[PDB]
UniProtKB/Swiss-Prot annotation, chains B, C, D:
Residues 3-137 form the THD domain. GO terms for cellular component: external side of plasma membrane; extracellular space. The gene is Tnfsf13. The chain holds residues 105 to 241 of 241 of the full protein. This is Tumor necrosis factor ligand superfamily member 13. Signal peptide: none annotated. It comes from Mus musculus (Mouse).
Curated annotation (Swiss-Prot), chain F:
It is linked to Immunodeficiency, common variable, 2: A primary immunodeficiency characterized by antibody deficiency, hypogammaglobulinemia, recurrent bacterial infections and an inability to mount an antibody response to antigen. The defect results from a failure of B-cell differentiation and impaired secretion of immunoglobulins; the numbers of circulating B-cells is usually in the normal range, but can be low. Immunoglobulin A deficiency 2: Selective deficiency of immunoglobulin A (IGAD) is the most common form of primary immunodeficiency, with an incidence of approximately 1 in 600 individuals in the western world. Individuals with symptomatic IGAD often have deficiency of IgG subclasses or decreased antibody response to carbohydrate antigens such as pneumococcal polysaccharide vaccine. Individuals with IGAD also suffer from recurrent sinopulmonary and gastrointestinal infections and have an increased incidence of autoimmune disorders and of lymphoid and non-lymphoid malignancies. Highly expressed in spleen, thymus, small intestine and peripheral blood leukocytes. Expressed in resting B-cells and activated T-cells, but not in resting T-cells. The gene is TNFRSF13B. Binds TRAF2, TRAF5 and TRAF6. Binds the NH2-terminal domain of CAMLG with its C-terminus. It is found in: Membrane. TNFR-Cys repeats lie at residues 1-34. Receptor for TNFSF13/APRIL and TNFSF13B/TALL1/BAFF/BLYS that binds both ligands with similar high affinity. Mediates calcineurin-dependent activation of NF-AT, as well as activation of NF-kappa-B and AP-1. Involved in the stimulation of B- and T-cell function and the regulation of humoral immunity. Disulfide bonds join C1-C16, C19-C30, C23-C34. This is Tumor necrosis factor receptor superfamily member 13B. The lineage of its organism: Eukaryota, Metazoa, Chordata, Craniata, Vertebrata.
C-alpha cells in the first residue's frame, strides 16, 4: 500500500489529486511541507 | 425567467490544523429563490440544471494554486470542476486568476463548496477578482 | 429569445501619454437588440441581467498582463471583473490567454469598457484569440 | 427549456505521424435535442445559437499548451476559440488548466472538434479537470 | 507608493509593485528606473 | 516559415516558432533539431 506522510517529506495534494514530494517544491511549498522544508 | 445569484467575498476562513481555505460569500445580484448563500457554502433549494462559475485571484508563490468546486448531498460528495494555476516564485510576479465553469445537475438539499486546498491561502477578497455565481437553466 | 452579441477585434489603440490599451470591436454574431459596439466601448440600450464574457490573448513578456472590464453609468465607474496572468520572460514562450466572465445587472445608458492597463500592450487581433460577448438572460 | 450536453474524457488519441492529440468524449449530462457526441467529435443536428465551453488540464513541460475548438461544415473549417497557457520547465510545477468559452451560430450537419496541436499531449482524463459542454440558447 | 523609491501603482493588480523586481519584463511606468538604475 | 531554418508552424499559436528558442520544452516537430 502507498504512504504519503508529511513527516517523511511527502503529502497528498487535494488540488492536484496526487502525492507530491516536498523536496521538489521547497521555497514554494504549502503548509504541509513546513516541517520538511524549513 | 432564469434565476441568478452572483456572490462576492466578505471574509476568509482557514481553520487551524486544516489544509483548506474557504471564502465567506455575500450576494450582490439575486433574481428568483432556488439558491442561498450560507457563509462559506451555498444551499440548493430547487432541483435543476445550473450553470456554475467560479474565479479566484491568487497572490501567492505556492507552486500551484487553485480551487475545487464540489457538491455534497445524500451522504456523498462529487467534484464538479477544478481550476489549477502554476505560480512563479517571485512575489511581485505571483498574481494569477483562476476561472472555471460548467453546467451541472444539482438536487434540493445539496451544498456547494468552493475550497482552496492549501492552509492560509493568499487570495484577493476583491469582488472583481474573486467571485462565484449560478444561473438556473 | 435571448439577445446575443459576439464581438472580435478590428484594431487596438493606446494613447501616447497613457498607461492603457483598448480594443476597437466589430460584431460577428448578433441576435436581438439592446447592445451596440461603438469603437472601443459597448453601449447598453436595454436594462437587464446579462452574461458578459471576455478573453484576451497576449503575446507579451510584461510581468503580468490582463484585462479590466467595467461599467460606466450614472456618473460612476464600477469594475465588473479582472483577469490576470503572469508571463514568462522569453518572447517565444510568452503567450497566454486570459478568460473571465460573470452575470451582471446593466442599465440603459451604461458604457462597457475592456481595458488592458499597460501602454502599447501586445495582444492578438485574432477573432478566436481575443473576443467579447453578451447574452441577455 | 434549454438543451445541454456536458462531456468528459474516456480516452486520448494521437496518431503517430501527426502533431495533434484529441479526446474521445462521453456524456455525463444530457438534456433535450440538438447534439450528439461521436467519439472525438460532436455532431450538430439542430441549427441554432449555442454556448460552448471547454477545459483541459495539462501536466506537461511543453513551452505552451492549449486547445483549439473549431466547427466544420459546408466545405469550410472555422476556428471558434482557443485557449493558450505557458508552462514552466520544471515537471514538478508544470500543472495548468486552460478554460475558454463563447457563443456561436452552429448549423445542422456541422462537426465540432477539440484538438490539442501537439503529438502525445500529457493531459488529465479526470472528468473535473478536462471537459466540454454546450447549452443551446 | 513613491516613484523615488522605484515603486508604481499597478492599476491591473491594484497593488504597489517594485521596479527592481521586474526589469526586463517591465511596463512603461518602470522604463526610467530600469534604464538608469546602474548609472 | 522555413523548416530548413529550424522553424515550425505552431498550429496552436498560429505563428512561426524557432526550435532553438524552446529546446527542453519542445514539441515533437522540434525533436530532431533539439536532440541533435
Ligand atoms: Ni431561457
Amino acid at each position: 500500500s502507498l504512504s504519503c506522510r508529511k513527516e517523511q517529506g511527502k503529502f497528498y495534494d487535494h488540488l492536484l489529486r496526487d502525492c507530491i514530494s516536498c523536496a521538489s517544491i521547497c521555497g514554494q511549498h504549502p503548509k504541509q511541507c513546513a516541517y520538511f522544508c524549513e | 425567467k432564469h434565476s441568478v445569484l452572483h456572490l462576492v467575498p466578505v471574509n476568509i476562513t482557514s481553520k487551524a490544523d486544516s489544509d483548506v481555505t474557504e471564502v465567506m460569500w455575500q450576494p450582490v445580484l439575486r433574481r428568483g429563490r432556488g439558491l442561498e448563500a450560507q457563509g462559506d457554502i451555498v444551499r440548493v433549494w430547487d432541483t435543476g440544471i445550473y450553470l456554475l462559475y467560479s474565479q479566484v485571484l491568487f497572490h501567492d508563490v505556492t507552486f500551484t494554486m487553485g480551487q475545487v468546486v464540489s457538491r455534497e448531498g445524500q451522504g456523498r460528495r462529487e467534484t464538479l470542476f477544478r481550476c489549477i494555476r502554476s505560480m512563479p516564485s517571485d512575489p511581485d510576479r505571483a498574481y494569477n486568476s483562476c476561472y472555471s465553469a460548467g453546467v451541472f445537475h444539482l438536487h434540493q438539499g445539496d451544498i456547494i463548496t468552493v475550497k482552496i486546498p492549501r492552509a492560509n491561502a493568499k487570495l484577493s477578497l476583491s469582488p472583481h477578482g474573486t467571485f462565484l455565481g449560478f444561473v438556473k437553466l
